[PDB]
Design a protein around this ligand. Structure first.
Ligand SMILES: CCCCCCCCCCCCCCCC(=O)O
Ligand SMILES: CCCCCCCCCCCCCCCC(=O)O
Ligand SMILES: [Fe+3]
Ligand SMILES: [Fe+3]
Ligand SMILES: [Mn+3]
Ligand SMILES: [Mn+3]
Lengths: 285, 285
């Protein structure tokens, strides 16, 4: 559809817009380059592992690898919908979001190549619950925005992408990674990438909060919609978490070798903690 | 539509793909930040000008300011269409393309604010020909890809965006800027931004060449389509160039003040030169 004007010809940018401030922060804090990470020690660590120690780590790399690729493809509709609404600053920020997710896909792929599991097909570690989030509810809530950019539709998209997938599952997976391999001294390069990802993630979640909150503020009925959609997806969050935990408990050889006290009951409380505190970053008024 | 698999879970990235190599170059060469540019001298230069010297420069800032905002919004469909075709490396590169265009909009807007013409409405300097490219043919060729991603549709989009708007008009405008203000010693910050833009542009054009060429290679009938669409748009290219030139010739006070020998006949041969050499970077086989 035609352009009926431009905002930097009639006016300029709203330099005070929060998303323009988040865009500035993204440029300042987002220079990291996955190609600069040294994985030579990760290749050694992975080689050194038993075959059952090798398996131990893969499920979590599987969920992250697919999940990074999901959001890289699935954030595009949000940028379309905000663009077409004239939210120039949001769009400017989303170009950093999309580039972040591209580096995230690059990072996990370079690790896989480095430790020798590139060809390996990690799809096996996506159970039914994971697919229901990432293969289904995520792409549907985002793609919807190409035809339906109502406040409800925008809230549901930010809830699934930013509050659940990033704000709940990715946050908990970063924690999990540290709680396990930071303790073992394993996979230094991967953990360097995880810290980089975690930092980017903070801005991803902050776009979600601002997007959800700016719609709640127009009509508090949408607060209810937000809590509802969060609760709708919790079964699949926790059923993927339960499944990964069951995998962890029958794969105990890396825990023993490295004297890791893998407290799965605690990881599970972190997930529950993340989910509830995302709810609490949305105010009903 | 559901995700039916992921390329960094079954395999990895194609590290040898040209667009993955262009993506790597973009990250290496694309760290510049418009917020780091010092425009304090540009504010002085613009203040120092007569009112008729002030007008002299604005038409070209008008076309660039709107034009940067056009491609920032209008490149999204290309990334959608390539994403949905599974061209992961192309998408990775396009995240840098879209972020480049965001910085380009930021750059021109920060200059406008710096020299005091933010509120000023530069739409007046878009004649009928400019609007036919930027207000019409560009958004239509890109938006089409949301429903029609045929090789014809993809060629036409890359031809209008990358070969004409960037490869012909933006290239010639960078030249023009140097031929005029590099000579005067004016607007150092703006010219620093133009060199940054010009460098980004090289990758933008190279994605267009690769996109057009990889489709020609499947069926040489599309070479004809490429030449045809290039020729279809030339009238509007040159009619905007003629209009800017007519503006320049009745606004001769900055030329005289600064002893600039503004050879408009030469700018016009540069445009013609750019257009023909874009045609020559597409091979018929
Ligand atoms: C054993 C404890 C389980 C903890 C939960 C781990 C979840 C693994 C990560 C999967 C989701 C990754 C989504 C990435 C989001 C993004 O890159 O923006
Ligand atoms: C007087 C000589 C005229 C020379 C032609 C000048 C054209 C001005 C620039 C307008 C198009 C800018 C498009 C930007 C493309 C991009 O940012 O990718
Ligand atoms: Fe994210
Ligand atoms: Fe460009
Ligand atoms: Mn990510
Ligand atoms: Mn540009």
């Amino acid at each position: 559809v035609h352009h009926d004007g431009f905002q930097t010809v009639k006016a300029t940018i709203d330099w005070e817009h929060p998303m323009f401030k988040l865009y500035e922060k993204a440029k300042r804090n987002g220079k990291w380059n996955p190609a600069d990470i040294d994985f030579s020690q990760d290749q050694k660590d992975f080689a050194s592992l038993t075959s059952e120690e090798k398996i131990s780590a893969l499920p979590l790399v599987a969920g992250f690898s697919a999940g990074e690729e999901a959001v890289t493809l699935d954030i595009l509709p949000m940028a379309h919908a905000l663009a077409r609404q004239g939210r120039l600053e949001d769009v400017l920020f989303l170009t950093t979001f999309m580039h972040d997710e591209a580096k995230h896909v690059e990072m996990f792929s370079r690790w896989q190549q480095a430790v020798g599991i590139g060809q390996m097909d990690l799809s096996v570690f996506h159970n039914d619950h994971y697919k229901r989030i990432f293969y289904e509810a995520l792409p549907e809530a985002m793609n919807r925005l190409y035809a339906d950019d109502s406040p409800e539709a925008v809230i549901r998209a930010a809830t699934v992408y930013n509050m659940i997938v990033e704000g709940t599952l990715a946050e908990s997976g970063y924690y999990t990674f540290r709680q396990i391999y930071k303790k073992a001294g394993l996979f230094p390069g991967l953990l360097q990438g995880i810290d980089y990802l975690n930092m980017d993630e903070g801005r991803h979640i902050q776009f979600g909060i601002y997007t959800i909150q700016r719609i709640v503020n127009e009509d508090e009925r949408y607060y209810e919609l937000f809590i509802r959609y969060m609760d709708e997806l919790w079964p699949h969050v926790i059923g993927y978490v339960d499944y990964l935990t069951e995998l962890g408990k029958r794969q105990q050889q890396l825990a023993r070798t490295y004297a890791l006290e893998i407290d799965y009951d605690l990881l599970r409380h972190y997930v529950i903690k993340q989910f509830n505190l995302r709810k609490k970053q949305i105010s009903r008024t």
